[PDB]
């Protein structure tokens, strides 16, 4: 920004005017606009080179909003920390960013990418016989790690419980750690010979998600985000069947845990003998050399009171050195206590499967040092138009509160006001009309309600079955 | 509306003034072009023959199919008093105005014209570098100040006086500021041709005691002039008028000779896009425009977030829409602006959506909506939010001795359209403040 006259309307843009830079002659082709200050990226999805960037942008920048035509990404430290893992250096990112930008990349953006892209690839955490060694490939790192205030070819031991500290400590210091597994050269752990039966049909995006994980040949630990119903179960199954090692699955429900075993059996050749479901109903464990455990966080993250029947199983889980962990619905692992399982269970590879990667608190970023970076993400509309997921006409009905009910809503306190505006009669009428209308259309309807009293009242009024927390499995 | 607006003004002028308005051929050659095609056809027929032609002869020319057009053509021609109906010998004879006739004959056949089209100094200037720049900037200043965007060089009092005195850009001393109105956004929504005619038409009505014909002898003559050439200097009123016209970016003056500009020729006749924008379901806006005029008008109802040389990106929000509505901008105009400034990508996708809709069921033809319906619905809903509370100023009438009297007074209010509410059980009714005195006076009588 030198010798650049401001415009009479520049006042409306408070230090956001980016006209101080000039446009390149090939603007009509290049699809990207780059914000030199906020790091935002505006992508033209209706111009050539749109597809070549829609995947490159997903790697280095988290997506803010991706509407029909104009996509909006943003570059942050964590997004770069995700891209730095899969064989990417600063030069490649800068080269492509300049090659795809209508405007030249500002120095500020170049500075941001340079800072965070050089950290990757000098510390490795390995596991041996349930003992965790922070192995480094050069001697110089000893004067850094052993002299760190928090910590405590050369390899040294570290407390199992203390992994969650050092891994976060590694982030603050120059070098963050990467959890790579060379399952090809791992012989000590007994193998499990399971493969996808020929009837399987690995969809493209599933292959892309796996490629971002097994690109180099050593399984990377991270998170895969796919829309609801995209087939995340088969993604985990394929990862288990390609690593070919004892695997454990954690899922946040009893119905869902049952779903996983049935899915695992159906899609691959996992013999039923080697599968054990550790839920509140049955707790038997496979005695075969290598097997599979599908359990839940509530049955694995408990600390204080475990029953005698559930104590032997937990010791069975802890004693062996597992080869793969599948954390279904990984948006709940950074909670106060669920994260403990990631440390107690020994594993050389960790995968996270979730359609939504968001939580109200600030603990979402904690996933980086728990299971690793985010490997792949997929659009929702892209899979919708390709027939992989259904199209939905979202609607929001405005049921005006009747005069009689509304008057009480003014006086009542916050906690009871909720029950008051959940049970207004107009909502009953709207739900009854929609249910009848869609039932005539031969549709299967689901009626959600976080409030149980309304759920029961609606169900008993309409004579329909209902499910809530007190229900036996 | 262009020819309609200019024609409509020319109709209200008294006949005594129209006769004087046709003395200069320059004006005649301009008024002739605005009439319907059939009107021009008949006018050209009568101009060269010094006789009187019965109306039935004119009727014979038109075919049965085009009979309707013959009614509008004759009506519009008679309204301007160009065609004089003379009835004699039992026939409704038709003749052309002698002054209009002579003027047209002089214009076409190159007769003495008394410099109606002006003269030439043969000292040309560069059109692209100066004329385009001068009027574009001068026209830019008036529109920028109109939109309310801050600007360094404010226009002179002449146009400022005209702006306020018009419905455009209502102002209040107590407020101390100027803001655009319902007609203001409509004015900014009109093409350059109509955008210029609105100001010139308002100037015509504003002037008082400068003849009305002279101000038209200049505007219509100004169309005859061709851009990029000199014209030496005319009526006394046309001198101050020329300087006044200089403030609207119509004529450029170095300081003896004046030069018309692109807008000068833009007055007579007609003649990716800049301003096209994309609106997403996320209520975002991306405008492919590089012009402070477009950015300013977008700022009326858009919360701008940043800009690049090629495009401008912002977000639609409740605050911006409320800000525009408070100024009198209707949601219908806003959607019109978005639809008529839509990017080709939106149009193509909308066409494909329509094609798929017709592919499954070709029975119904859904309207082609370029931009998503949710944005339109939300904007209209916000307008309803502004319309939630309804209040009238007026009086409540009560304590009636007799039902007859209550019905009599209330029914009278209904008849004159000043009744807002009534209740037979309570013998009460409310009438607007406007109709209070009429109801009181009727009550006494």
């Amino acid at each position: 920004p030198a010798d650049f006259v401001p415009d009479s309307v520049s006042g409306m843009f408070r230090s956001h005017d980016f006209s101080y830079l000039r446009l390149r002659p090939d603007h009509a082709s290049r699809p990207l606009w780059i914000s030199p200050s906020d790091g935002r990226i505006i992508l033209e999805s209706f111009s050539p080179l749109a597809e070549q960037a829609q995947d490159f942008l997903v790697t280095i920048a988290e997506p803010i909003s991706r509407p029909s035509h104009i996509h909006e990404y943003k570059i942050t430290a964590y997004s770069l920390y995700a891209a730095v893992s899969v064989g990417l250096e600063t030069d490649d990112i800068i080269s492509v960013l300049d090659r795809l930008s209508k405007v030249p990349v500002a120095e500020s953006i170049i500075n941001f990418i340079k800072g965070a892209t050089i950290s990757y690839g000098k510390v490795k955490l390995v596991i041996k016989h349930n003992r965790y060694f922070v192995e480094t490939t050069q001697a110089d790192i000893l004067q850094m790690l052993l002299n760190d205030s928090v910590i405590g070819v050369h390899s040294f031991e570290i407390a199992n419980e203390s992994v969650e500290v050092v891994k976060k400590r590694c982030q603050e210091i120059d070098y963050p750690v990467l959890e790579e597994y060379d399952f090809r050269n791992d012989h000590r752990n007994p193998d499990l010979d399971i493969d996808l039966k020929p009837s399987t049909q690995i969809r493209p995006y599933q292959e892309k998600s796996l490629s971002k994980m097994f690109g180099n040949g050593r399984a990377r630990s991270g998170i895969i985000v796919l829309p609801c119903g995209a087939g995340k179960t088969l993604v985990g199954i394929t990862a288990a069947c390609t690593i070919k090692k004892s695997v454990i699955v954690l899922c946040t429900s009893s119905v869902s845990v049952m779903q996983w075993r049935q899915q695992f059996l159906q899609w691959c050749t996992l013999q039923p003998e080697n599968c054990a479901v550790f839920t509140s109903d049955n707790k038997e464990m496979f005695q075969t050399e290598s097997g599979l455990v599908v359990s839940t966080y509530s049955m694995v993250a408990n600390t204080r009171n475990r029953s005698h029947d559930s104590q032997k199983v937990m010791d069975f889980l802890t004693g062996r050195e597992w080869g793969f962990i599948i954390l279904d619905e990984v948006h709940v692992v950074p909670a106060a206590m669920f994260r403990r399982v990631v440390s107690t269970i020994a594993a050389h590879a960790k995968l996270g499967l979730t359609a939504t990667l968001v939580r109200e608190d600030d603990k979402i970023g904690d996933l980086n040092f728990l299971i690793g970076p985010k490997l792949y993400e997929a659009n929702w509309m892209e899979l919708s138009q390709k027939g992989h997921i259904a199209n939905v006409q979202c609607a929001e009905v405005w049921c005006p509160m009747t005069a009689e009910f509304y008057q009480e809503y003014l006086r009542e306190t916050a906690r009871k006001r909720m029950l008051l505006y959940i049970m207004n009669p107009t909502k009953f009428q709207a739900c009854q009309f929609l249910i009848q209308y869609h039932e005539r259309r031969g549709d299967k309807i689901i009626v959600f309600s976080d409030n149980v009293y309304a759920l029961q009242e609606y169900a008993l009024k309409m004579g329909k079955p209902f499910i809530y927390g007190s229900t036996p499995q | 509306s262009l020819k309609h607006s200019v024609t409509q003004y020319l109709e209200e002028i008294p006949q005594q003034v129209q006769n004087r308005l046709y003395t200069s051929p320059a004006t005649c050659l301009a008024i002739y072009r605005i009439l319907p095609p059939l009107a021009k056809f008949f006018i050209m027929a009568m101009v060269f023959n010094e006789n009187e032609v019965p109306l039935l002869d004119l009727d014979k020319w038109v075919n049965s199919n085009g009979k309707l057009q013959f009614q509008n053509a004759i009506k519009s021609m008679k309204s301007l008093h160009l065609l004089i109906p003379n009835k004699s010998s039992g026939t409704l004879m038709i003749n052309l105005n002698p002054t209009f006739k002579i003027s047209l004959r002089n214009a076409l056949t190159g007769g003495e014209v008394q410099n109606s089209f002006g003269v030439v100094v043969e000292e040309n200037v560069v059109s692209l570098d100066l004329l385009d720049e001068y009027s574009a900037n001068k026209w830019e200043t008036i529109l920028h100040f109109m939109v309310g965007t801050p600007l360094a060089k404010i226009p002179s009092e002449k146009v400022l006086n005209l702006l306020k005195h018009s419905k455009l850009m209502e102002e209040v001393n107590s407020t101390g500021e100027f803001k655009i109105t319902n007609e203001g956004f409509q004015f900014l929504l009109q093409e350059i041709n109509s955008q210029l005619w609105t100001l010139l038409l308002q100037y015509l009505k504003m002037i008082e005691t400068m003849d009305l014909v002279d101000v038209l002898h200049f505007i219509f003559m100004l169309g005859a002039l061709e851009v990029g050439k000199a014209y030496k200097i005319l009526s006394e009123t046309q001198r101050i008028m020329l300087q006044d016209m200089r403030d609207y970016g119509l004529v450029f003056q170095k300081h003896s000779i004046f030069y018309p500009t692109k807008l000068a020729l833009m007055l007579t006749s007609d003649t990716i896009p800049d301003g096209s924008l994309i609106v997403e379901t996320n209520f975002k806006i991306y405008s492919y425009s590089n012009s402070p005029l477009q950015i300013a008008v977008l700022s009326l109802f858009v919360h701008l977030k940043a800009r690049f040389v090629n495009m401008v990106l912002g977000q639609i929000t409740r605050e911006s829409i409320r800000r525009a509505l408070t100024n009198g901008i209707t949601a219908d105009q806003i959607i019109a602006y978005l639809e008529t400034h839509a990017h080709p990508q939106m149009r193509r996708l909308a066409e494909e959506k329509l094609e798929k809709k017709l592919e499954l069921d070709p029975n119904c033809k859904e309207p082609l909506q370029v931009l998503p319906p949710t944005v339109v619905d939300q904007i209209r809903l916000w307008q309803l939010e502004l319309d939630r509370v309804i209040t009238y100023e007026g009086s409540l009438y009560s304590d009636f001795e007799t039902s007859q009297e209550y019905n009599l007074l209330s029914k009278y209010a209904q008849d004159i359209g000043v009744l807002l509410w009534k209740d037979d059980k309570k013998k009460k009714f409310f009438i607007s403040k406007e109709g209070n005195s009429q109801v009181l006076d009727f009550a006494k009588r």
């Binding site: 009905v397 405005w398 049921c399 005006p400 009747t402 009669p425 107009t426 009428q429 709207a430 | 319906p373 339109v376 619905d377 209209r380 809903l381 309803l384």
Partner: peptide, 10 residues
Amino acid sequence: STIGKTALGR
């Protein structure tokens, strides 16, 4: 788009 129509109810 059902904006101007009367609200739903009994």
